[PDB]
Each structure stands twice: as C-alpha cells, then as structure tokens.
Design a protein around this ligand. Structure first.
Ligand SMILES: [Mg+2]
Ligand SMILES: [Mg+2]
Ligand SMILES: [Mg+2]
Ligand SMILES: [Mg+2]
Ligand SMILES: [Mg+2]
Ligand SMILES: [Mg+2]
Ligand SMILES: [Mg+2]
Ligand SMILES: [Mg+2]
Ligand SMILES: [Mg+2]
Ligand SMILES: [Mg+2]
Ligand SMILES: [Mg+2]
Ligand SMILES: [Mg+2]
Ligand SMILES: [Mg+2]
Ligand SMILES: [Mg+2]
Ligand SMILES: [Mg+2]
Ligand SMILES: [Mg+2]
Ligand SMILES: [Mg+2]
Ligand SMILES: [Zn+2]
Ligand SMILES: [Zn+2]
Lengths: 96, 51, 79, 63, 118
RNA sequence: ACGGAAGGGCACCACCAGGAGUGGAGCCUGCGGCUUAAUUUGACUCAACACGGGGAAACUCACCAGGUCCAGACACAAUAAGGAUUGACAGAUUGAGAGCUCUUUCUUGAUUUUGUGGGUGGUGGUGCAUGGCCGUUCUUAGUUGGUGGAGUGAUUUGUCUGC
RNA sequence: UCGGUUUCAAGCCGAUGGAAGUUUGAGGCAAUAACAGGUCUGUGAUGCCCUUAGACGUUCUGGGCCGCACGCGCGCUACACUGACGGAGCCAGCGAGUCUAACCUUGGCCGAGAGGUCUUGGUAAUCUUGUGAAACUCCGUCGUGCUGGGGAUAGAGCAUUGUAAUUAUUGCUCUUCAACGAGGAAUUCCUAGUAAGCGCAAGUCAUCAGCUUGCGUUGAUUACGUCCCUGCCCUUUGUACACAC
C-alpha cells in the first residue's frame, strides 16, 4: 500500500512491544486511537501483515482485533533490526 | 483528495454495533443494535420476555 | 454511613440488604419502585405476515470507621 | 473515451548542479525560508515563482 | 462515567453480549460455555466457563496475557483492572452451547451427519 | 384429502341482538397504473397494500446525470538507485478551492507501480440452492412410540359408545 | 359453604359469603407434520453465478423515491344547536432524560404568536412533574340556512430545524373559505371499566405524526344464544381425487 518505509514501520515497535491491536472498522477515521496514523493505515498494514503470516486476526462486532504469531518473532529482524530474542512482547513486562 | 469523506449525524452516522446496518436501529438507552440483531443478542443483554 | 444498592436479580440484591442489617448490630449498635425498561419491537426480521409485536423487559430494583472500610468487601455503591 | 495515466516525467535525475573548474559546488536555483527545506530541497522553478519541492503546501518563497 | 443506572445496565449487558459473541467467535474451536462477569470492587473479573481450559496460557503465560491486554485495548480499560479468571465448565455435557460447537467441528471434518448427531 | 353426505361439538378473524363504523366528501399515507434521465425495490386472499419498524430534503440509497479514489491483501516475473513510486502553488480546468487529465519541473524514496495470477468488496442475482428468524396452516386440541391384540400387506388398535 | 342437579360419577346451575367465583380479569409460553409462504435489502450468516479500475466496490456533486386524465387498501378531519366559540372551573396514568457532553427543562424578564433570552434543578421515587393532558364541568355569545358548521385551496409576512427548506420540513399572523346537507351495492371490529369518545408518553427523531407500541380519563347500547352464512374440530359414510374439488 501507498505508505513509505517511515509508515509501515511507523509501528514496527507497537507490534513487537505491545503485542496486539484494536481498530474499529472505520476507513477514513484517519486518526487511530492509541496510534499515530490513519486508522486505515494500521488495518491495511495488518492486512499485509496477516496475509503473509506472522499475525492473525478476528472480527467480533466491527473491532478488527489482531494478534501475532511466533512466526512474527523472527520476522521482526529483517528490516525490524532488533537484537535476536533480546526481548519479546508477552515476556517479563509487568507480571511475567 | 480531501473531497473524499467531505460530508456528514442523522441516519448516515448511526449503525448497529454488530452489522454496520443503518436501518431499523434501536437506540432507546443507547444500545444501538438492529431490531433483528437485538432480538438475537437480547437474551443475555438483560431483556427477558415476561408478558 | 449511607449506602444505596441496585441490581436486576433480587436474591443477591437482598443477600446484602440482610447482610448489612446484620453488620448493623456488628457491636450491638445502630425499597425503591422497581424500574421496568420496555423495548417493544416486531417479531419478524423482514416485513411479512401478521404484524406481530413483542415487548421485552429489564427489571431494575433499587434499595437503601475501621468497620466502614471492611463492610464493602450486584452493583455496590455507597456515599 | 477512457481515462489516462500520469506521465510524471522522470528526466535523467536531478538535472542541475554545476562544477566550476573541477571543481567546487557553485549552486543554482533558490532555497526556501524553512528548515523543512533544510538544505535537503532547493526550490523548484516552474513559472512566475520558485515554489518548493517539499513545501508544496505553504512557503512560496521568492528573491 | 455519569450515566443513569438505566443506561449503564443496558451497556452492562451490551458489554456482556459483545464480550460473549466475541469469545464464541474467538475460541469456539477450543470449547467454550458462557462467561461470568463479576461486578466486584477494583478489578472487573471475567470468569470464563470453558470445556478444554489450557487454551488460555500458551507459552506458560502467553495466551491469557494476549487476551487480557486485548479486551482492555478495545474497551479502553487501563491495564490490570481486567482479570481474566479462566475456570472450567460445570459438567460440559450440561451445555448445549458447548456441544453445538462440539458438532460444528465434528461434521466439519466429514463425519456423516447421522453418525455425528446421534 | 375432498363431498351441493350423515351424527355430534365449537368460534364476534362466524352469524344472531346491537353498538362504532368503513364503502360517499376533503386531505394524510401505502399499492397499482400512467408519466420519467430515474421515478430503486420486496410483498398481491385470509396470511401484500401507515407492512419491510419503509415518518426518504443531505446521508439513508439500493434508482438517475456526472466527478474522485483503491481502502487491487500476499506470491512471482517487471521496473529499480547514472530515478520504481508518490505529490503539488497558479492557470487552462471544472458544480467545485480538484493537480482526475494537460502546461509546468519540482518533489518523493522501495513504500508501488506495469503485468500474470490471486484476493477483496458488492442494498448485484437466485427465499426454487441454504442457515437463523418469522408468518401461516391452527387458537384450535391435537401428535407419537414400547409392548402385546387384529391384518399376507400398506395399515390399524392404543388415540373409544355415552356423558 | 348451603341448596337444585345429576344418571353412581365427572360436572353444570342457583345462593350466601368475599377484594376477588367467564380457567377470577388480561398476557407470556406453547407440540407433531408441513408451505418451494416471506426474508440473500439486518448480519463481518451463506452455496453457486455475475462484477472487480471506464467497478455493480467506494466516495463526492446534484436529481429521484413525493412526479398526476385515473382504480383500490389502512387512516385523519367533518357535515353541527348532545354543537362552535369565549371566558371559567380543573382531574390521570405508562414513560424517557447530559461528561471524550450540550439530553429533559422549572423560575425571572422580551414578544400578539411562533419563539427569543439570562439564570436554574435533575444521571432522575428527589429535578422537569401534581407532567394544572384532552374529552369533560359551570357561565355567556351565536340561531338553521353551507351559518359564527367545515377548513380544503391559495396570497402576503414573521419565526424554528439544519452545510443546504425551491418541489411550501415544521410552528405563528392575517387573509382566501372548495367538496361535505349523514354516505349505493358491499364490508371491518367488538361482549365490561369492554365498544366507542378523549387526550398523553414511548419508538421514529436535527426538523416533521394524520403511523405504530402502550398508558389512563369519560364510559354506554346489546347478547350470556344458534349452526343460517363464513368456518374449525371429532366420528361415520362415498370416491374414478394423491400435483389431493
Ligand atoms: Mg373515503
Ligand atoms: Mg387465520
Ligand atoms: Mg438521495
Ligand atoms: Mg448521492
Ligand atoms: Mg451500493
Ligand atoms: Mg421459502
Ligand atoms: Mg405390534
Ligand atoms: Mg390411530
Ligand atoms: Mg403450533
Ligand atoms: Mg416462492
Ligand atoms: Mg449477496
Ligand atoms: Mg416510498
Ligand atoms: Mg392494513
Ligand atoms: Mg370554525
Ligand atoms: Mg368549551
Ligand atoms: Mg368478516
Ligand atoms: Mg411507520
Ligand atoms: Zn444488527
Ligand atoms: Zn519550502
């Protein structure tokens, strides 16, 4: 989709850091609550994300929930240059 | 462009929170569910039938 | 003290009312109208046939120092 | 009677910056009045002004 | 907040509904009877009656953690006020809602209808 | 099952006794028809026709006259750092202050463009391919099986004369 | 309970008693077998087909769904003197209502009105609200003829909703003042606080109720029966019907 590499990894962090997304289905919301972009961009990015793997989705009343797989946790190295397994999302953050 | 979503409340703003449906919306107490969608999910929302 | 409590079911609504007139004697010391919310729509999903109507109902019943903070531990609220 | 694409004529990349005597940066065209044209864009020259390349919204700077 | 008890009790059950046909729409394939929402001080405990239950902790913590932060993100709950207690259903042969899902998957693997219904 | 066949029984969606009417008038509103660029459409006995919660100025919007956009995911081949893509002041433009397309020559940085597939959305079609729900038959009392009894059998008795 | 009744019964009828004696009144629930009944125009329910960039996707601008020789279905308002109007008396119940905000609105002024305005209370058994509703009730005016019954049609002006009122959104003011003189053949609904008359809240909803879902106020006439019509149920009967008169 039409979004230069400062956008598709505008979040390459909220994904690996937080772990999941929420986005009520609203193209032209253009201001995601909890994230700095169009709400269109996250979903279309998550589309592009899920349709390659690394992340799943579920729908339940127009709220487009996303979740990522262990396949994600080694794809956030090719252009998401982070130290290998130095950290993850559902690891020791608040109670793990 | 910026002429994309360049128009408005009324029916065009409201929709059932289950199907995106603009029509036949039940909004008394602000639940915002289709009459049809309401009658299915009404069992556990709190509305039982007595009389 | 003064507490106001509410719920939809009545049993565990009145398993605290009694459970508070018994902490009322905790050291040998010191009903609202029910609100029925009516949703009244059609049985049919489309438009066909006998024109049949169907009321639903929610029933809302409401009632009303060291020992204070260990009494609040159904919709619980107090001021 | 169908619609049409965009030509976006590429040119053989940035066409203008001049070497003097092999050499030194001699420069040509104009810059804007912002650090959003912070020496990463020197302004266009189309017709009647030197409008930006990055500041295509505000900042019609002239000299 | 600032809602008359009418409009939030409505929105209490709406929350329960969306929660539920979220849960069913999410983990029917793992076995799931209803959900209990404890309206309790501090936390809002969501006890989940489930048939097969270890489908909630993944890499020893990695699943309910993935869910707890999910329900709050949509419902704007600040972290740690949503406790996802994950119980196990009372006598799973008690729930039509469970067994219907036990058959939806059963027939969805080609087992003859008279076979997998009877 | 049906009978302008018999015996019972029972209903104001039956009559009787009557009320209040409707059918006539004016306007509201729905259906047809005619009309139209389109007058979106579903439903036609009860059980279509102030019914689709259908009280439509925009939205709704499905129709009609036009104008944008991709919100064409992912794979492959292509383009590709000596420019892939994207964008735009003003005018020409146009309902428009819209850079859709042209003039113009600046941006922009592998983000998506060209193509083959392959998706996706679809108030597009089929309620004579379905689910769920609903209406109706049917507001009435009716329906079934185990065992034995009758019959080669389909079937029947049970589920009955009378009250 | 007492009697009358039964045919032993099941019950039915009368009475006294009682807040209550038609299952006490009214509802919710509701079987088996079915219909090619209706709904893909409620679903991010869905098989197959069609479409997918000059799009049937989507958005934006503007029009239409309202368009008027005509037929029909639900209704609203009336032909008046058991009325219209003007003062006056003044009595309900079911409900809904605002903070990632502008809902229900009292009281003070301004305005003939519609409405305008500065406060105000209420997340509501508290406040709006006794919702001072309307029919109705007391007192007057009019005088039988389209009249002061009737308010359709239309002109002119002032307001409100809303980016936007033109093909009047709706409210107000004055003016215009049509058919209609109790509705042919037909035909709907109804047995008690029911029919009908009367208004009110709720759904809708930015604005718009002549609609619907309910609630109370005033409150009758007439049957407490039949199988004539329409028609359901149970036997028995006949059939050349079985896609079933
Ligand atoms: Mg008429
Ligand atoms: Mg019938
Ligand atoms: Mg329109
Ligand atoms: Mg339009
Ligand atoms: Mg469409
Ligand atoms: Mg059908
Ligand atoms: Mg036998
Ligand atoms: Mg038999
Ligand atoms: Mg039945
Ligand atoms: Mg058919
Ligand atoms: Mg479809
Ligand atoms: Mg229409
Ligand atoms: Mg009708
Ligand atoms: Mg008059
Ligand atoms: Mg009077
Ligand atoms: Mg009749
Ligand atoms: Mg209506
Ligand atoms: Zn819905
Ligand atoms: Zn600049």
């Amino acid at each position: 989709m039409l979004m230069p590499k400062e956008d598709r990894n505008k979040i390459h962090q909220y994904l690996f850091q937080e772990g999941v997304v929420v986005a009520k289905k609203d193209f032209n919301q253009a201001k995601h609550e909890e994230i700095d972009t169009k709400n269109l961009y996250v979903i279309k990015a998550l589309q592009s994300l899920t349709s390659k793997g690394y992340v799943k989705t579920q729908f339940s009343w127009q709220y487009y929930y996303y979740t990522l797989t262990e396949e994600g946790v080694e794809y956030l190295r090719e252009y998401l240059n982070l130290p290998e397994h130095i950290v993850p999302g559902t690891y020791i953050q608040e109670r793990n | 462009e910026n002429v994309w979503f360049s128009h408005p409340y009324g029916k065009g703003s409201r929709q059932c929170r289950v199907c995106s449906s603009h029509t036949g919306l039940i909004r008394k107490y602000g639940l915002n569910i289709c009459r049809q969608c309401f009658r299915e999910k009404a069992n556990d929302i709190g509305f039982n039938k007595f009389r | 003290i003064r507490i106001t409590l509410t719920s939809t079911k009545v049993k565990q609504l009145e398993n605290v009312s009694s459970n508070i007139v018994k902490n009322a004697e905790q050291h040998n010391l010191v009903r609202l109208p029910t609100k029925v919310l009516k949703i009244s729509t059609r049985k049919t999903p489309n438009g066909e046939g006998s024109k049949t109507w169907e009321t639903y109902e929610m029933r809302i019943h409401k009632r009303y120092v060291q020992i204070v903070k260990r009494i609040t531990q159904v919709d619980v609220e107090v001021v | 009677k169908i619609k049409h694409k965009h030509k976006k004529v590429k040119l053989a990349v940035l066409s203008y910056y001049k070497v003097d005597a092999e050499g030194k940066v001699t420069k040509l065209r104009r810059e804007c009045s912002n650090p959003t044209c912070g020496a990463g864009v020197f302004l266009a020259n189309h017709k009647d002004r030197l409008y930006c390349g990055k500041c295509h919204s505000v900042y019609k700077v002239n000299a | 907040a600032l809602i008359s008890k009418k409009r939030k009790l409505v929105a209490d059950g709406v929350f329960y509904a969306e929660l539920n046909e979220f849960f069913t729409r999410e983990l029917a394939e793992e076995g799931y009877s209803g959900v209990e929402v404890r309206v309790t001080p501090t936390k809002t405990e969501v006890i989940i009656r489930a048939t097969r239950t270890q489908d909630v902790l993944g890499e020893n913590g990695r699943r309910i953690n993935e869910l707890t932060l999910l329900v709050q993100k949509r419902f704007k709950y600040a972290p740690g006020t949503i406790v996802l207690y994950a119980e196990r259903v009372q006598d799973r042969g008690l729930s039509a809602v469970a067994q219907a899902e036990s058959m939806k998957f059963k027939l969805l693997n080609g087992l003859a209808i008279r076979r997998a219904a009877y």
